Design a protein around this ligand. Structure first.
Ligand SMILES: *SCC1=C(Br)C(C)(C)N(O)C1(C)C
Length: 164
């Protein structure tokens, strides 16, 4: 397991524009296009992102290209953020993947707002951090995914992604 395989499990792979868990137009491996409710605005975002006139469908290779860009972007957003960088640096490689996963799903700003959780992770109080991470809109709206990410932070293992 690694961050790409982990997010591929959590986000799936769909080659046609679809609505994510929040109702927002998305494509590929969890690539958010727009929060606009207009499908035409989502198709324009897709065409800009891929560099061609797509009308809403992409190839697997194109989905994987956006995914590489999005993982890179989540890591660089962590390292550019004064709240997230020190936490990332303090973690082992498995827990770093969990933090990348959360930033991929909810964005740099969203995760950096989890101050109490981030502090417990920096302190390596893993069970306390896990309890605290579950007290969130995130957990309530995507509980199975959040449980997998939280088990990853609690244990520093990939056990929640095994048999997936
Ligand atoms: S991370 C939120 C905060 C905590 Br736990 C203490 C240390 C009490 N603070 O002063 C805040 C609000 C920064």
């Amino acid at each position: 397991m690694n961050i790409f395989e982990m997010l591929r499990i959590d986000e799936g792979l769909r080659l046609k524009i679809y609505k994510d868990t929040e109702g927002y137009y998305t494509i590929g491996i969890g690539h958010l296009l727009t929060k606009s409710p207009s499908l035409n605005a989502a198709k324009s975002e897709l065409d800009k992102a891929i560099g061609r006139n797509t009308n809403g469908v992409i190839t697997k290779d194109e989905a994987e290209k956006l995914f590489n860009q999005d993982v890179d972007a989540a890591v660089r957003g962590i390292l550019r953020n004064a709240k997230l960088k020190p936490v990332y640096d303090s973690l082992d490689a498995v827990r770093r993947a969990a933090l990348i996963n959360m930033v991929f799903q909810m964005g740099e700003t969203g995760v950096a707002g989890f101050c109490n959780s981030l502090r417990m992770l920096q302190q390596k109080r893993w069970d306390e951090a896990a309890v605290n991470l579950a007290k969130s809109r995130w957990y309530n709206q995507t509980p199975n995914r959040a449980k997998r990410v939280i088990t990853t932070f609690r244990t520093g293992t990939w056990d929640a992604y095994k048999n997936l």
